[PDB]
């Protein structure tokens, strides 16, 4: 705290309480007693625990029928109107679309829709696999997920 | 029909004014004006000028005959206290209070 390290009054003789610093955390505009620092909240997850969780939640999405498997899922031109038409034909609104390739027209056509997210099969995460209502996997992306996860 | 007049921020203590305001509560205004005329307090000058304003507001703004009017409610509230520093001996300072008031006079028929 910007201040001075001088006693606001002497120790005794005056009728007031003892005080040593105006920077005291009991004063107005004093310090915070246990003032915080920039800290890192990242936790370690074991590799086998991360894969156990993914193999668990993909088993649960299968048992809950929240997993859709198609051979290919492409949009010809990078248009969100075309993607919204295709998802309306699939009866999908809130969906994660994992694809084993880099489709730029699909990324751009899915970038503006907040109900829709498009990932690579490598860039999948458990919180997305839970937060989305349906998950569409390319059969190749299934083959890649099965290969990473044995 | 009630008619209100107020002298807010009356430069006087509320305790000093409530002594005068308690003399004319419930009285006819011709008697209250005679009491305030022959009362020697400064607050009688204040509350008389307020009672005269309430009478003129009741006659002009509300249509009322003066002989039937009667002081039904009168009360003094504490105002903002401007505060000054008065020096005492041995460098000690005392913070005096310079009280104000809010005089309110309600005059009516009923």
């Amino acid at each position: 705290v910007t201040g001075s390290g001088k006693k606001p009054w002497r120790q005794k003789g005056t009728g007031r309480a003892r005080s040593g610093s105006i920077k005291s955390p009991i004063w107005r505009s004093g310090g915070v007693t246990f003032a915080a620092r920039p800290q890192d909240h990242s936790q370690k997850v074991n590799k086998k625990m991360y894969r156990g969780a993914l193999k668990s939640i993909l088993s649960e999405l299968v048992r809950q029928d929240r997993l859709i498997v198609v051979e290919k899922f492409s949009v010809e031109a990078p248009k969100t109107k075309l993607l919204a038409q295709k998802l309306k034909d699939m009866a999908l609104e809130d969906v994660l679309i994992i694809t084993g390739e880099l489709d730029e027209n699909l990324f751009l056509a899915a970038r503006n829709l907040h109900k829709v997210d498009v990932r690579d099969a490598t860039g999948i995460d458990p919180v997305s696999l839970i937060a989305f209502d349906k998950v569409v996997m390319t059969a190749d992306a299934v083959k890649q997920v099965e290969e990473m996860l044995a | 029909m009630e008619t209100i007049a107020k002298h807010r921020h009356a430069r006087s203590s509320a305790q000093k004014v409530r002594l005068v305001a308690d003399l004319i509560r419930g009285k006819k205004v011709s008697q209250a004006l005679d009491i305030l005329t022959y009362t020697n307090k400064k607050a009688a000058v204040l509350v008389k000028k307020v009672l005269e304003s309430a009478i003129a507001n009741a006659e002009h703004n509300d249509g009322a005959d003066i002989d039937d009017l009667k002081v039904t409610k009168i009360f003094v509230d504490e105002g903002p206290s401007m505060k000054r520093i008065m020096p005492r001996a041995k460098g000690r300072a005392d913070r005096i209070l310079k009280r104000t008031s809010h005089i309110t006079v309600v005059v009516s028929d009923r």
Binding site: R10, T14, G15 | R84, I85, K90, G91, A93
Partner: peptide, 27 residues
Amino acid sequence: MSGKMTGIVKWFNADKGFGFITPDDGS
């Protein structure tokens, strides 16, 4: 109105006016 200097450091007691009103009888 710019009316500070009331209880700032209470110099009131920084005066620390001599105490011990000739009572060194409590020895």
